Structure 1
Amino acid sequence: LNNIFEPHVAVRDAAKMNIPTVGIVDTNCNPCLITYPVPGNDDSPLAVHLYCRLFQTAITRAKEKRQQVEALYRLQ
């Protein structure tokens, strides 16, 4: 949601451009166009910090996994 409590225009724009979307959807949000909605609290700093930590860890681990798989493939 944007600062007038309406959906972020980027949701509809990404749907138009066929870009998958992951999203934290609170009880007052619209999850219809988010490809992978995640119901949860988006206001408390603890929840937002947890979301950031989880996503950062997942992305970093995925990139490291790709690099080590490529290294193993090159070695073998």
Structure 2
Amino acid sequence: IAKRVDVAFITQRWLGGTLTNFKTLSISINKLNKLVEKQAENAADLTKKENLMLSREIERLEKFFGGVKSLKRLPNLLIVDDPVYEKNAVAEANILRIPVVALCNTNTNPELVDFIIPANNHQPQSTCLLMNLLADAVAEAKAMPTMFAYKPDEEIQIEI
């Protein structure tokens, strides 16, 4: 979904502090730009240790700050697969004023989510269908094609 639609994404969950302030996000994006445009000219000149450190820093930035490189203002929306296992960001959003839309079956606190989606994520097919539906929902805004919104077919795929 992230490689399909030009929107930011999170690979590994937040460690806290990466969403409450913009200055850390600003130094992160500056580090990303400096790292990429400097490693564009440094791949085998010195010892393998520094080049491997550059690659490791790139991979770490992908792990944590991978998707946050196209924003100048704080994210106006975020979609969560479950309030459990992602409590930090949703708690910050309660502290903040940003609206929250999230998936939750029954293991949530409905107070922490302002747009409840009682869609169970235990079965992979339902999660895939809802994720594609939301991708198509955000697709129309940027004038890009939609695939599964009114299609008379259910996404069936054996668990990998």
Greater Rg by CA: 2
> What letter corresponds to residue 18 of structure 1 in structure 2?
R
Q: Distance in 2 between matches of 1:27 and 1:17?
A: 24
Aligned-pair identity in percent equals: 31
Is residue 48 from structure 1 mapped to residue 123 from structure 2 by the alignment? no
2-side partners of 1:56 and 1:31: how far apart?
24
Per residue, is there more helix in 1 or in 2?
1
Matched with 2:6 is: none
1:15 pairs, out of 84, 90, 94, with 94
Q: CA RMSD in A?
A: 1.6
Aligned equivalent of 1:62, options 141, 149, 155: 141
The CA deviation at 1:33 is 1.5
Q: Scaled by the length of structure 2, what TM-score is found?
A: 0.36
Shift of 1:42: 1.5
TM-score normalized by structure 1?
A: 0.70
Letter in 2 for 1:56: A
1 or 2, which has the higher strand percentage? 1
CA distance in 2, matches of 1:55, 1:14: 20
Return the alpha-carbon distance in structure 2 between the equivalents of residues 42 and 31 of structure 1.
16
1:29 and 1:63 mapped to 2: Cα distance? 32
Runs of 4+ aligned residues of structure 1 deviating over 2 Å after TM superposition are none
Gaps of 5+ in 1: 66-76
The 2-side partners of 1:49 and 1:14 are apart by: 25
1:24 to 103, 106, 116: 103
Could you tell me how far 1:37 is from its partner in structure 2?
0.9
